[PDB]
Amino acid sequence: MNTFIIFIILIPIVGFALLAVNILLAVYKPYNEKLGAFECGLTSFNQTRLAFNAAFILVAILFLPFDLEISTLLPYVMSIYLVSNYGFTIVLLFLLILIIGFVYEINTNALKINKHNKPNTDSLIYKL
Amino acid sequence: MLILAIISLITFVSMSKLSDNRAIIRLINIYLILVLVLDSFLYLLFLNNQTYTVMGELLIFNSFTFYIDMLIYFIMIVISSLYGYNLYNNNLYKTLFEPKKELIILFLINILGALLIVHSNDFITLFVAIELQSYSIYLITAIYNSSYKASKASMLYFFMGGILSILIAYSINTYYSVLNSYTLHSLDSLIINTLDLNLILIALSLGLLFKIGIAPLHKWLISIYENTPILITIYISLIPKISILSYLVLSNISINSLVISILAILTLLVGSVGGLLQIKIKRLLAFSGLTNAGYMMLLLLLNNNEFSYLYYITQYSISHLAIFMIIIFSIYYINYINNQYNPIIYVNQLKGLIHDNAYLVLSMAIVVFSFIGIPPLLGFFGKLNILMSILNNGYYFISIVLIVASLISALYYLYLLNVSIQDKNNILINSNETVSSVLSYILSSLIILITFGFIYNSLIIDIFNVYFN
Amino acid sequence: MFIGTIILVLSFLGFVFNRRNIILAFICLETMLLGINLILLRNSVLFDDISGSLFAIVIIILAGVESAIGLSLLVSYYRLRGVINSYGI
Amino acid sequence: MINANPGFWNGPFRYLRWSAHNRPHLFFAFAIGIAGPVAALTLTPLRRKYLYPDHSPLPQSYPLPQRAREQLTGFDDE
Amino acid sequence: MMYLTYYFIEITIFLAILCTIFIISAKNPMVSILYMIALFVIAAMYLYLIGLGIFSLLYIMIYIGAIAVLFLFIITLLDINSTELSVKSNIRDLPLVLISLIVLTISGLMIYSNDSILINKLLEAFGNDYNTIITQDWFNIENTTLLTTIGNVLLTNNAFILLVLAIVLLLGIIGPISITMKHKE
Amino acid sequence: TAAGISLTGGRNRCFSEWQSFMHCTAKTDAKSRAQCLPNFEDYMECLHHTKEKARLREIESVLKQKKE
Amino acid sequence: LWARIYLMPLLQAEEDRQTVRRSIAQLEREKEIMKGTGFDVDKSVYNDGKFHAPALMIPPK
Amino acid sequence: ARQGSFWPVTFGLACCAVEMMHVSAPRYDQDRLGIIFRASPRQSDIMIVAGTLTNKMAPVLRQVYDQMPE
Amino acid sequence: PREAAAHWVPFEDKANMPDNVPDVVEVGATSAPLLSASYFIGAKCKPYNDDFMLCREESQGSGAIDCLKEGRRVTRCAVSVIEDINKSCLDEFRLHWQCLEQNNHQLSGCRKAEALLNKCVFTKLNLEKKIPGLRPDEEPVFLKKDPWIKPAVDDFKSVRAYAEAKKNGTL
Amino acid sequence: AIPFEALLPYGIIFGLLTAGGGAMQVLHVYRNGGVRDRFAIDQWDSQMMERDLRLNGGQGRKQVDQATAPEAFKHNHVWKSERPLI
Amino acid sequence: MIINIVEILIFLVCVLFSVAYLTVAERKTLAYMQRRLGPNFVGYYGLLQAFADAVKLLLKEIVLPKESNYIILVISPLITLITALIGWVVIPLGPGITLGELNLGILFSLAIGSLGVFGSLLSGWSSNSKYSLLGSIRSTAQLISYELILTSIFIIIIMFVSSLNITTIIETQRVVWYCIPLLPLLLIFFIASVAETARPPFDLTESESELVAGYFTEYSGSPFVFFFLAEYSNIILISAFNGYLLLGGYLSFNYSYLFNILFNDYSYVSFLFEGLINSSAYAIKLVFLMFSFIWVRAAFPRFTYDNLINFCWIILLPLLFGIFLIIPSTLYIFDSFPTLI
Ligand SMILES: CCCCCCCCCCCCCCCCCC(=O)OC[C@H](COP(=O)(O)OCCN)OC(=O)CCCCCCCCCCCCCCCCC
Ligand SMILES: CCCCCCCCCCCC(=O)OC[C@H](COP(=O)(O)OCC[N+](C)(C)C)OC(=O)CCCCCCCCCCC
Ligand SMILES: CCCCCCCCCCCCO[C@H]1O[C@H](CO)[C@@H](O[C@H]2O[C@@H](CO)[C@H](O)[C@H](O)[C@@H]2O)[C@H](O)[C@H]1O
C-alpha cells in the first residue's frame, strides 16, 4: 500500500460522493416539458446523420499518424546519448521523410473547408 | 531509386495539377527504364551464387531476388505505360482510363513492399513489408471511389487481409516463443529434426498463401478482381503473387508438406473446374491465375526450385500482361460499353474480333496456347520444367492432377479464342482513329517474347548455371 | 500466453460470427492484434529479450496506420452509399 | 490576384522575398529546419578544431582487460 | 496479507473474457467500443503486472487515446445500423462456435511446446506450477530501461525498419487524402 | 540484428548456451552438425525449463505420496 | 559509473558465494528428500559440465 | 446558498433588458452578489421576464419555465 | 536479471557454506560509505578485481564456484581499505557519507567533504582519486573550481570544516 | 499592487499549496528518518537499499560505516520466488 | 500507512480548495480588469462564493431529458474529474516530494491527458440530437489537434534531459530554466494549453452552442459541479506542466548561503523552510499562469473552427517539425547529447 496506489484507487471509488449527496438531497419530480429539450425544434423520421465536410474526419484520421510519429520519437530522446551521431542522422532522415507527407498535406489543402455558394466574379456583358 | 522516386513524386504531385498526372507517369516510367538499363550490371555481384546480408541481417540479396526485382520493374513499366499513354484520343477513352492523382505513388510504395518481401531475411522486415504491400493495395483498390463495386472490394480486401495478417503475426510470435528468434537462418538440419516445427511454419505459409487466393479461400479475391477496374485488376492480380510466392520459394519452409500438397491439388481442381461456367472475362482470368498459383505452389516442396519458379513466373507475368492488354485493346470493337470502370465484362462481347482486328486475335491465340502449354511457346517449357522438378522429387499423383488440370483449363482458355474467331455481322470497314504506338509496341513485344523466347533457352540455362549454382 | 490466446480466439469468433456490425469487425481485428502483442511481451519478459518488445511497438504503429486506412475506406463506402447496413460489408 | 505566387523557377530570390512577406509561417519553418542539418555538416569540424574536441567515451560496462592472468598474492587465507 | 495479490493475473484473464463477451453482446456499437477500451485497460494492467508499465502507458496513450477516439469519431458521424443479438439469428452458430472454441484454444496451447506426442503438448502448456527464482547481479552499471534499449536497437541495429515505418506513416497520410478528398483540378 | 540483447541493453538470459551452440555450428558441417545436439538441448532447456520441471515434479511427488 | 565499476566485484563476489551456498544446500536437501530411490539428484539437466543455479523451485506454501 | 448564487435565465425580450445589462455593468455589478446569467434554463434558478410578452412568444416562455429545475 | 513481477515471496536459506570453502568476512558497509570509498577501493584492489573478473570470464559458466579464492581476496582488500579509513580517517568519511545521504547520493553535493577526505587519505594511506579514461586536456569534474551544478543546500558541518581547514592550512 | 481584494484568493491558493508542500516535506523526512527523499532510483540503488536493510536491523535507510558485517549478513540473504507468468 | 493517508488528504484538500478559490480569482480579476468588483458579498470579501455555488448546485434536481441517456450523462463528468485529479499524483512540490515518484511520470501525465477527450466525445451521445453530435466532433478535433503540440514540446524538452522523471527534469533546471533557451516554446505551450482547456479565445463550441438549443454541456446539479472542478483543475495541471517543463517547477534562487547563515545542522525547521520556499516558488508560478489564463480571457476575441484548425496544423506544427531538427543539431554541433539522469 503506497500513496500512489491509494490515491489512484481512492479517486474513482470515492468520486461518486457528491453524486450520492445530490441524488439524496435534491428534488426530483419531472414534467414532460422538463424532460423536454428546447425553446422550439423538431425533426421527423428523416435520417440519423447530417452531411459533414471531409476535413472534419480527416483531422481525426491524420491525428493517428502524426501522433504515432511524435510517440516514435520517444525512444530516440531516451536513447539520445547511446545512439551518438548515428541515430541522430537516422532520426533526421525519419523526420525528413515524415515532413514530405506533411508538405503533401499542406499543398493539397486537405484541412481546408470549401464554400459552395461562391460570390459571382464574372463580368456583365450585354449582347448589343 | 524507388524511395527517391516516392519522395520526389510526392512533392512533384502535390505541387502539380490533375492535368499533369499522365505526364508524371510517363516521366517515372522513363525513370524506371533508365534504372533497369544503367544499374542492372549489379548482377556481377552474385557470380557463383554469392549471397549478401544487408542492414544488419535484415535483408538478403542474391541472384533470385535481383531477378525478381528486375521483373517487378518490368511489370511496373508496362502497368505505368497503360496509365500514361492514351489508347485513343477520344472523349470515351478520356472518361474510362484516367489516372488518379495518388495512384502512381501508391503503385511505387506497393512495389517497395513487394521487394522488401522478397529480400526479407528477418520476420520483422517481412511483416513490415507485408503490411506496406497490403495497405497500399487496399488503397489502390479504393482509389476509384466513384465505383460502388470498388469500394465494396476495398473493404472486403481490408478485412480478409487483416485476418490473414493476424495469422502471420501469430505464426511469427509463436516461432519466437519456441526458438527466441525472428530469423529462418536460425534453422538447420538438427533444429528441424529435433523440434517439431511444422505447425508454425505451415501456418505462416498459409497466412501468406491465402493472401493470393489459395483454395478454399479464393472466392473473395476473385470477387475483388472482378469488381475492381481493369487497369487496377491487372496490377493487383499479379504483383502480390510474385512477391509472396518468391518469398516462400526462397525460404524453404514446406519441403514435403502434406497440407500444402492437398491444398495445391485443391487449387488446381478448383481453378480448372470453376472457370468452365464463368461468362465474365476477369473471373475467368482470375481462375487462370489460381491454377497457375497452384502450379507454383507445387514447387514449394522441392528444395531446388529456382529455375522452374523463375521461368514460370516470368512467362506467366508476360502472358497475364498480354491477355489483359488484348482485352483492353478489344474495347474499340465491342458494341456495348458496360461501365466507366469495366468497359468489357463478358466473353461473348469479343465475338467477331477477327473481322475487325485479325492480328489482335493472333496475339490472343498465341497467349491462349501458351496458357494451355502448347509448344514451341513459353508456357510449355514452364510446365516442362515444373514437371521435371516434381517428378525428380517424387510427386507422381500431383503430376497426373497437373495434366488433368492443364486439360480442363484449356476449355475456358479456348472459350475466348473460339468466340473471337467466330463470324459477326456489322464488321468494321474503316476507322480514322488509330490506337497508340507505344502500347501497340509493348503488346507486340510481349507476344514476340512468348513466341520466340525458346531460341534463347540454352543461353539462359548457361547463365543460370553460373549465377544460381 | 493464456490471456492473449483467449482474447485472440474470442475476437476471431466474434469476427467470424458477426451478423450485426462492421464496427465489431474493426474491434475484433484490433483486439486480435492486442492478444498477439500480449503473448509476445510475456515471452519478451521471460526470455529477457528486446526483439519481442521491438516487434510489439512496431505492431502498435502498424495497427494505428491500419485503423486509419480502414476508417478512410469505410468513409468512402459511406460517401457513395450513405448508410452502413447490418450486412453487405 | 493581388500577391499571387511568382514561381520559384522564374526567380529564386524574388520567390523567397515573396515567401517571407506572404508566407512567413512556412518560410521560417523551412529556415529553422534547414539550418540544423547544414550547420551540423559545416560547423561541427570547426568546433572540433578551434573550440574543443569531442569527449572521451564513457565506460558502459566493466572494462575487462585484454590480457592473460597474472599470479598474485596478498589477502590469501590464514 | 502476502497472497491477497496473487490471483491478479487470473482476475485479468477473467475480466478479459467478460469484456470480449460484452463487445460481442452490446446492443449499440458505442458500447462495444467502450468495452474495447476496458479491455485495453485490462491488458495495460496485466502488462504492469508482468513488469512492462512502459507498454501500459504507451497503450493508454496510443490505443485508447487515438484509435478508440477515432472509432468514436466515426460512429458519431456515420449511420451504422445494427441487428441486435438474437436467438432466431445467432443460435445456429453454437455447434460450430463450440467446436472452433475447443479446437482453436487447444491448438493454440499445443503449438508452443516441442514435444512429439500430441496430448503431452497440451499437458506441458498447463504445467504452470513452479516458481521462478529472481537472483540479483551487479553487472548492469547504467540506468538502461526498456524504452532506452528499444531506441538503441531501433536507431542502430534496426534503423531500416524505422526508415520503412516512415513510409508506412506516409501511406497513413497519403492514402486517406486520396480516398476521402476530391481534388478539384 | 537485435539478437542477444536484453531488456537492459546487454546479454540475454540464455546467451551463453546459444553462443556455445553457434561456436559448435561454426566448427561443423551439415554432416557433422549432429555433434551440436547437446548444445541445442541446453539452449532449449535454458529457454523453457522442461527437464527441470520434470525433475521437480519427481521431487514433489516423493514429497507427496510417499509421506501421505 | 566508475564508482559503481570499482564496487562491482565486491558485491558480485558476495552474491556468488551466496549462490554457491544455496545451490549446494538445495542439492543436499533434495538428497534427503530422495533417500530410498535411485534418482540421481546431482545429475544435471544440462549436458555441459557447467555450474547452473536451479532457476526454478517448488513454491514455499 | 440560494441567495449567494442567484443565476437567472437570459430571457430579455425588450427595453428592460437594457436595465438588466446595466445591472451587469460596472456601477451596479450583479456579480458582486453572486449573480451570473445563464443561457440554458437547465442551469438556472430564476426567470426575469424583462419585456413585453407577445402571444407569439408565450409558449416559448412557458417551455423555458418548465425546463427549469426546481 | 529482471526484477520480480506480479507476486514474489522472499525466502532465506539457513544452510551453511560447505567446508571445502574457507570462511571470509563480509564488507558490512551500507550504500553511502561504500560510494565514498569506491575510488579508494579501486586504487588498491585493481589487480585483485580484474583477476576476479578474468577468472570469471575464463571459466565460461562456472564463475560462481571457480572464482571463490579470487572473490575472497577482493573482499579482504575492500575490508582492509575500510578498516584503514575507520582507524584513521573516520570524521571526514562520516561527513562525506552523511552529506551523500541528505542528497540523493550525488557526489556533486559533497565536494567540500570530498576534498578533506581525499587530502586525508592521500597523506595517510597514499591513495588518490583519479577518474580514468580522460585526456590531459579534460578537467575532472571533482576538481572544478566553479561548477554549473551545485547543491541546493551545501552541508553545514562540511562548510564549517572546510572553513576551519582553510584557516588552518590543512588544504 | 492595488486591488488586494482580487489578490486574496491568489493568496489563499499560494498559501495552501505552500503549506501543503511544506507539510509533505516534513512527512517525507519523518518517513525517512531525518534524511531527504531518494528520487530517480534505478535497479542498482534498489538492490543497494535492500542490502542496507540486510546490514541494519531492517531500520530503513540507516547507514553503517563498519568494515566487517555481523555474522547474520551471511544468512540474511533473500532470493525472490516469483509466480509463473501466464 | 497512516502518514500516507495524511499526505494524501493534505494534498487533496489543498488542491480542491485551490480550485474552488481559482473560480473566485477568475471572477475578481476579470472584474477589476473590467473596472468593476465581484464577488465580494457572499462571504467576507467574497471568500465563500464558490461554496455557495456548490451548495446550491448540490440541492438542484438532476433532470435528465426524455431522449437522453442516464448513465453516460451522469458518469462523463465523473470520468473527466477522475482523470483530471489522478494527473496530480506525479506533480512534485519539492525534490521527490510527490505522491507518485514515477520514473515514467511524463508519460503518465501525457497518457492521462489523452483521456480527457472522452468527456467531450461522450457528451454528444447523451441526447438524440444530430447537431450536438457534430459539436462533439468539432471540440474533439480541437483537443486531439493541440495534443500533438503539447506532446511535441514535451519531447523537445526531453531532448535536453533524457528522463521521464519530473523531479529530474526540474533538477536539470538548476542551471537554466528551459524557458530561456526555448522562449517561443513557452508561448506555444501556453497557447496549446489554453486550447486544450477549451478556454477563451478557444471557446468555440461552448460559445457556439449556447446560441443553439444544444451542442454544449446542459448539465444540472452534481454533474455541473464535477465539470467545473474538472475544468478548473485541468487549468492548474496544464499550468503545472508549463511549470515543470519550462519554468523550473519549484526552483528559485540558491538559498545555500542563507541557510548556512540561519542554521548549523539539519533540523525539522530546516526541512520545513526548504519545503515552504520550494512550494512557494511552484505556487507563485502557478498563480502567474492562472492570471495569464484570466488575462487572455479578458483581452482577446474568439476564434472560429477553421481559423483554429488552420492555426494549429499549418502554423504551429511546421515550426515544431523544424525544431525537432534544430535542437538535436545544436546538441550534435557542441557534443552535448544528454546522459540518462
Ligand atoms: C488467424 C485468425 C486468428 C485465430 C487464430 C486461432 C489460433 C491459431 C491455431 C493454430 C494456427 C492455425 C494453423 C492452420 C491450420 C494448418 C496447420 C498445418 O497445416 O500444420 C500441420 C503440420 C503438419 O503438416 P505437414 O508439415 O505439412 O506434413 C508433414 C507431417 N509430418 O503440423 C502438425 O503436425 C500439427 C500437429 C497436430 C495437432 C493439431 C492440434 C488439434 C487438436 C484439436 C483436438 C480437439 C479435441 C477433439 C475434438 C473436439 C471437438 C468437440
Ligand atoms: C531480367 C529482366 C526480366 C524481365 C523480363 C524479360 C526476360 C529477360 C530474360 C533474360 C534473363 C537473363 O538473361 O538472365 C538469366 C537468368 C539469371 O541470370 P541473371 O542473374 O539475372 O543475369 C542477367 C543479367 N541481365 C539482367 C543484364 C540480363 O536466368 C533465368 O532464370 C531467366 C529465366 C527467364 C526465361 C524467360 C526467357 C524470355 C526470353 C528472352 C528473349 C530475349
Ligand atoms: C469549482 C468549485 C466547485 C463549485 C462550482 C463553482 C461554480 C461557479 C463557476 C463560476 C466561474 C466563473 O464563470 C463565470 O464567470 C463569469 C462571472 O461573471 C461569467 O460571465 C458572465 O458575466 C459577465 C460579467 O458581467 C460577462 O461579461 C459574461 O458576458 C457573462 O455574462 C461567465 O459566463 C461564467 O463562466
PDB file of C-alpha atoms in Angstrom, chain J:
ATOM      1  CA  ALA J   1      -0.367  46.031  -6.258  1.00  0.00           C
ATOM      2  CA  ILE J   2      -3.592  47.966  -5.875  1.00  0.00           C
ATOM      3  CA  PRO J   3      -6.542  45.503  -5.827  1.00  0.00           C
ATOM      4  CA  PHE J   4      -5.961  43.468  -2.682  1.00  0.00           C
ATOM      5  CA  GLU J   5      -9.476  42.009  -2.817  1.00  0.00           C
ATOM      6  CA  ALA J   6      -8.610  40.345  -6.127  1.00  0.00           C
ATOM      7  CA  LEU J   7      -5.287  39.041  -4.764  1.00  0.00           C
ATOM      8  CA  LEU J   8      -6.828  37.473  -1.648  1.00  0.00           C
ATOM      9  CA  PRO J   9      -7.923  34.288  -3.493  1.00  0.00           C
ATOM     10  CA  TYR J  10      -4.497  34.066  -5.124  1.00  0.00           C
ATOM     11  CA  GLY J  11      -3.013  34.436  -1.657  1.00  0.00           C
ATOM     12  CA  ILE J  12      -5.160  31.570  -0.403  1.00  0.00           C
ATOM     13  CA  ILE J  13      -4.092  29.365  -3.327  1.00  0.00           C
ATOM     14  CA  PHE J  14      -0.454  30.308  -2.727  1.00  0.00           C
ATOM     15  CA  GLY J  15      -0.694  29.650   0.996  1.00  0.00           C
ATOM     16  CA  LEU J  16      -2.483  26.328   0.642  1.00  0.00           C
ATOM     17  CA  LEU J  17      -0.076  24.911  -1.925  1.00  0.00           C
ATOM     18  CA  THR J  18       2.919  26.269   0.008  1.00  0.00           C
ATOM     19  CA  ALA J  19       1.756  24.766   3.307  1.00  0.00           C
ATOM     20  CA  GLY J  20       0.964  21.517   1.526  1.00  0.00           C
ATOM     21  CA  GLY J  21       4.459  21.283   0.109  1.00  0.00           C
ATOM     22  CA  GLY J  22       5.981  22.101   3.479  1.00  0.00           C
ATOM     23  CA  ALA J  23       3.940  19.554   5.406  1.00  0.00           C
ATOM     24  CA  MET J  24       4.716  16.981   2.721  1.00  0.00           C
ATOM     25  CA  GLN J  25       8.446  17.676   3.022  1.00  0.00           C
ATOM     26  CA  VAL J  26       8.186  17.190   6.782  1.00  0.00           C
ATOM     27  CA  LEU J  27       6.179  13.976   6.459  1.00  0.00           C
ATOM     28  CA  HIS J  28       8.586  12.556   3.881  1.00  0.00           C
ATOM     29  CA  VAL J  29      11.520  13.329   6.181  1.00  0.00           C
ATOM     30  CA  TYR J  30       9.726  11.736   9.138  1.00  0.00           C
ATOM     31  CA  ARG J  31       9.121   8.672   6.974  1.00  0.00           C
ATOM     32  CA  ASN J  32      12.805   8.520   6.003  1.00  0.00           C
ATOM     33  CA  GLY J  33      14.285   9.285   9.440  1.00  0.00           C
ATOM     34  CA  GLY J  34      15.817  12.729   9.100  1.00  0.00           C
ATOM     35  CA  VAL J  35      17.012  12.371   5.502  1.00  0.00           C
ATOM     36  CA  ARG J  36      15.648  13.886   2.320  1.00  0.00           C
ATOM     37  CA  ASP J  37      13.956  11.629  -0.191  1.00  0.00           C
ATOM     38  CA  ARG J  38      15.555   9.496  -2.856  1.00  0.00           C
ATOM     39  CA  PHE J  39      14.440  10.001  -6.430  1.00  0.00           C
ATOM     40  CA  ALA J  40      15.306   8.740  -9.893  1.00  0.00           C
ATOM     41  CA  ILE J  41      16.330   5.427  -8.355  1.00  0.00           C
ATOM     42  CA  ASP J  42      17.378   2.651 -10.722  1.00  0.00           C
ATOM     43  CA  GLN J  43      17.859  -1.083 -10.199  1.00  0.00           C
ATOM     44  CA  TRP J  44      21.303  -0.576  -8.639  1.00  0.00           C
ATOM     45  CA  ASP J  45      20.101   1.737  -5.884  1.00  0.00           C
ATOM     46  CA  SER J  46      17.150  -0.524  -5.099  1.00  0.00           C
ATOM     47  CA  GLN J  47      19.448  -3.517  -4.684  1.00  0.00           C
ATOM     48  CA  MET J  48      21.826  -1.447  -2.559  1.00  0.00           C
ATOM     49  CA  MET J  49      18.939  -0.302  -0.355  1.00  0.00           C
ATOM     50  CA  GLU J  50      17.881  -3.917   0.148  1.00  0.00           C
ATOM     51  CA  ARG J  51      21.485  -4.708   1.067  1.00  0.00           C
ATOM     52  CA  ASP J  52      21.359  -1.874   3.595  1.00  0.00           C
ATOM     53  CA  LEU J  53      18.192  -3.398   5.029  1.00  0.00           C
ATOM     54  CA  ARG J  54      20.203  -6.590   5.421  1.00  0.00           C
ATOM     55  CA  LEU J  55      23.079  -4.851   7.214  1.00  0.00           C
ATOM     56  CA  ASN J  56      20.939  -2.799   9.572  1.00  0.00           C
ATOM     57  CA  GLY J  57      18.169  -4.456  11.529  1.00  0.00           C
ATOM     58  CA  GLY J  58      15.522  -3.587   8.981  1.00  0.00           C
ATOM     59  CA  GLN J  59      15.887   0.055  10.028  1.00  0.00           C
ATOM     60  CA  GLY J  60      15.084   1.609   6.671  1.00  0.00           C
ATOM     61  CA  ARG J  61      17.784   3.924   5.369  1.00  0.00           C
ATOM     62  CA  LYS J  62      20.070   3.756   8.414  1.00  0.00           C
ATOM     63  CA  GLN J  63      23.668   3.631   7.209  1.00  0.00           C
ATOM     64  CA  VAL J  64      26.590   1.669   8.646  1.00  0.00           C
ATOM     65  CA  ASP J  65      30.277   2.531   8.234  1.00  0.00           C
ATOM     66  CA  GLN J  66      31.873  -0.520   9.867  1.00  0.00           C
ATOM     67  CA  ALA J  67      34.346  -2.649   7.947  1.00  0.00           C
ATOM     68  CA  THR J  68      33.067  -6.134   8.848  1.00  0.00           C
ATOM     69  CA  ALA J  69      29.460  -7.210   8.783  1.00  0.00           C
ATOM     70  CA  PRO J  70      27.627  -9.084  11.525  1.00  0.00           C
ATOM     71  CA  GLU J  71      27.525 -12.838  11.048  1.00  0.00           C
ATOM     72  CA  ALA J  72      23.788 -12.537  10.354  1.00  0.00           C
ATOM     73  CA  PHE J  73      24.557 -10.934   6.970  1.00  0.00           C
ATOM     74  CA  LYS J  74      25.803 -14.328   5.774  1.00  0.00           C
ATOM     75  CA  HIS J  75      22.413 -15.996   6.364  1.00  0.00           C
ATOM     76  CA  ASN J  76      20.106 -12.980   5.817  1.00  0.00           C
ATOM     77  CA  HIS J  77      20.272 -13.268   2.015  1.00  0.00           C
ATOM     78  CA  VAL J  78      16.989 -13.045   0.106  1.00  0.00           C
ATOM     79  CA  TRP J  79      16.113 -14.701  -3.165  1.00  0.00           C
ATOM     80  CA  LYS J  80      12.713 -13.906  -4.644  1.00  0.00           C
ATOM     81  CA  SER J  81      10.419 -16.711  -5.810  1.00  0.00           C
ATOM     82  CA  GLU J  82       8.105 -15.344  -8.484  1.00  0.00           C
ATOM     83  CA  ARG J  83       4.688 -16.558  -9.608  1.00  0.00           C
ATOM     84  CA  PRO J  84       4.578 -18.178 -13.063  1.00  0.00           C
ATOM     85  CA  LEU J  85       3.576 -15.575 -15.629  1.00  0.00           C
ATOM     86  CA  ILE J  86       0.627 -16.560 -17.813  1.00  0.00           C
TER      87      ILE J  86
END
